[PDB]
Amino acid sequence: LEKLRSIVSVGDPKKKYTRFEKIGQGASGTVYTAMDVATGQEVAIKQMNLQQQPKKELIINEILVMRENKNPNIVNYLDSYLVGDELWVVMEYLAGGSLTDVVTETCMDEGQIAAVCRECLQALEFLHSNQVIHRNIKSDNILLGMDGSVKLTDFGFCAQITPEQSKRSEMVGTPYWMAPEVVTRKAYGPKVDIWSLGIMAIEMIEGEPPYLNENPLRALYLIATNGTPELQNPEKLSAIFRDFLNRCLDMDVEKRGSAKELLQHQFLKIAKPLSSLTPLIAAAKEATK
């Protein structure tokens, strides 16, 4: 809390931003829409409430890692404020919503799946080069722009590796997206996010990650004992797509591809413009309406 107090900005956020309009809830807190009074840029603010914050060290890590690792494929952090018992986190606004709404309500073609994977891999190649392991890659941590921009968010679970203390060993993430080495409690590397991306590609195909009908503990045991998840209907996908997924979901960490390596895959060469994701966004919004 003392370290937290010395990260936040000076000044009234209520007097710096106006046109506040609630666009969601509510795990970590309320999400509002706003407009910068001086610039006119449209911003997205999350009101946290520190009483519902369990670890707290997480909130500082999220803020610090977002700050130090700015890239076109990472939701652009603006500023933070502590009004009174509440923590306000100001970011660029991505009105397109989350990938979750797209994967759960729409059927994505191979060219669109490829486009998202490419952008997601660009975010990962950036973080892994800066020795940052995201650890919670899943459709829910992908925000879309109205133009079709793909941006990575939620850095609360991330780990900073060093040539001295790398790999990592703590069972962190969301069960259904976790790599077998994470679940089994082995020392793991950045390639855990690659596995999480393969699961997110399965979401894009099937609408949900393997074992979602199960309870998280069962899923942990199913990822541990079964490994590489089998698809409902593999025959529906192309060979180059079937290959991209095998490289993402390989049990052998050394065999599993890096973001640098997967960015060169034949699959991403069939990727469509990001404007091809705008009819998906339009359908998701109509479906969840």
Ligand SMILES: Cc1ccc(CO)cc1N(C)c1ccnc(Nc2cc(N3CCOCC3)cc(S(C)(=O)=O)c2)n1
């Ligand atoms: C304010 C914020 C701060 C820090 C971080 C880092 O964790 C993320 C954000 N968020 C969640 C952002 C950032 C930029 N843009 C958006 N856009 C957006 C979010 C939502 N949700 C709110 C409820 O929970 C799920 C996400 C809904 C819609 S929509 C469908 O109404 O157009 C748009 N949200």
